[PDB]
Write a structure and sequence with these properties.
Elements lengths: L15 E4 L1 H9 L7 E2 H14 L10 E3 L4 H6 L3 E3 L3 H10 L1 E3 L1
Helix pairs in contact: 1-2
This protein binds ligand 2U1.
Family: Belongs to the MDM2/MDM4 family.
Protein name: E3 ubiquitin-protein ligase Mdm2
Subcellular location: Nucleus, Nucleoplasm; Cytoplasm; Nucleus, Nucleolus; Nucleus
Length: about 100
């Protein structure tokens, strides 16, 4: 129910957040059953989502294409690198309240 990364301080990935309605629906579409999460939890579910709807079928280039997927609207970008973790958190932050 969680994924952490070496690029973000360990404590930041425990930050408690309430996803805004769109982020929440994405989380809930892949099993999430609550409204309040830690950032590492959100990242886990977003990761699941990204892979259920095949937004990242090509693993060897580390790009998630999402221009015409909900994730694209959530992030407001057509695509992004899965290696650029700070940016991902940045984009996620916009779509939630920090408890
Ligand atoms: C199945 C896995 C391997 C458990 S996963 O982590 O859920 C897979 C997804 C994949 C859809 C893009 N994903 C990743 O593959 C990679 C890049 C795999 C990875 C994890 C850790 C480290 C490290 O600590 O150095 C390096 N690489 O991680 C993406 C990730 C994970 C946690 C936070 C962020 Cl911001 C990104 C992470 C990811 C990227 C984007 C989002 Cl929105 C969510 C998760």
């Amino acid at each position: 129910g969680a994924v952490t990364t070496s690029q973000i301080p360990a404590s930041e990935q425990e930050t408690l957040v309430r996803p805004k309605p769109l982020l929440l629906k994405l989380l809930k579409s892949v099993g999430a059953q609550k409204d309040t999460y830690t950032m590492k939890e959100v990242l886990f579910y977003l990761g699941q989502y990204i892979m259920t709807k095949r937004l990242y079928d090509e693993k060897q280039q580390h790009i998630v294409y999402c221009s015409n997927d909900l994730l694209g609207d959530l992030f407001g970008v057509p695509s992004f690198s899965v290696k650029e973790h700070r940016k991902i958190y940045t984009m996620i932050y916009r779509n939630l309240v920090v408890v």
